[PDB]
């Protein structure tokens, strides 16, 4: 079976170098070129180029030239994407492909998310959020959990060990000083709080911090 796996999420800093690996299976490696496609932070897919594999020849898209590279290893069927002088604007997801030439490809790579930032590994600030009188609308009391300033991704935010997923919305996090801030809100009826325990469980194995915070009434 043809399945393209890549190096996983990579943590980088501006000014360094990286070689992004693409490991291929199900076919002879030198027989298919590797189409490299960058996904811009705005979710634009920007095509990096294709490497003639035989012959080991990279073909760059002009915008990607001279700070990027395509290198290969034939025996283990691993294609490599080399990047020099890392830049924060390069934070993105990268992809490889098994070449069907001018019709492109039938199989997409697993993807590689490069993160170029200059933070310190940090545990999140996990705050139980007490709803006020105006926060109780329509028989339900909405509760929330602020996850503030954690690096790196991901964080597992559950509620009462994940026992109640009903009204749980775990929102994405964006960059603040290269730190991530997200919030998660559980929606339970007003009869369940503060009658029943509601505790947001934030598991951040990257910083090795599992935080448990219960919301208390005011």
């Amino acid at each position: 079976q043809v399945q393209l796996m890549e190096s996983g999420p990579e943590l980088k800093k501006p000014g360094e170098t990286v070689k992004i690996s693409c490991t291929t299976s199900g076919y002879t490696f030198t027989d298919y070129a590797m189409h490299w496609v960058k996904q811009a932070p705005g979710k634009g897919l920007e095509w990096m180029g294709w490497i003639n594999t035989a012959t080991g020849e990279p073909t760059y898209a002009y915008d990607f030239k001279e700070r990027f590279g395509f290198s290969l290893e034939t025996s283990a069927s691993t294609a490599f994407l080399q990047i020099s002088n890392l830049k924060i604007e390069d934070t993105a997801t990268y992809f490889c492909a098994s070449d069907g030439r001018y019709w492109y490809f039938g199989v997409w790579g697993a993807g590689t998310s490069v993160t170029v930032s200059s933070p310190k590994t940090t545990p999140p600030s996990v705050y139980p959020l007490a709803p006020v009188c105006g926060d109780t609308t329509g028989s339900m009391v909405t509760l929330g959990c602020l996850v503030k300033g954690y690096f790196p991704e991901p964080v597992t935010v559950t509620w009462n060990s994940g026992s109640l997923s009903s009204g749980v919305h775990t929102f994405p996090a964006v960059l603040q000083s290269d730190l991530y801030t997200l919030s998660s809100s559980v929606t339970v009826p007003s009869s369940t709080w503060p009658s029943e325990t509601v505790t947001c469980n934030v598991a951040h194995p990257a910083s090795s911090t599992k935080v448990d915070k219960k919301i208390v009434p005011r």
Partner: protein, 50 residues
Amino acid sequence: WGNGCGLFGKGSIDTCAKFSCTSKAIGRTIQPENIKYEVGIFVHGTTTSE
């Protein structure tokens, strides 16, 4: 296999160099009406060396 490629014996390159002229000659074409002729004419009378 040592330089830049995985094959042998051949290659292709495009060599470009910006042209800069240090010095250039210029030609001229002569129009017939524009040609003038200054013709000194003199008759011998009483004359000196001056």
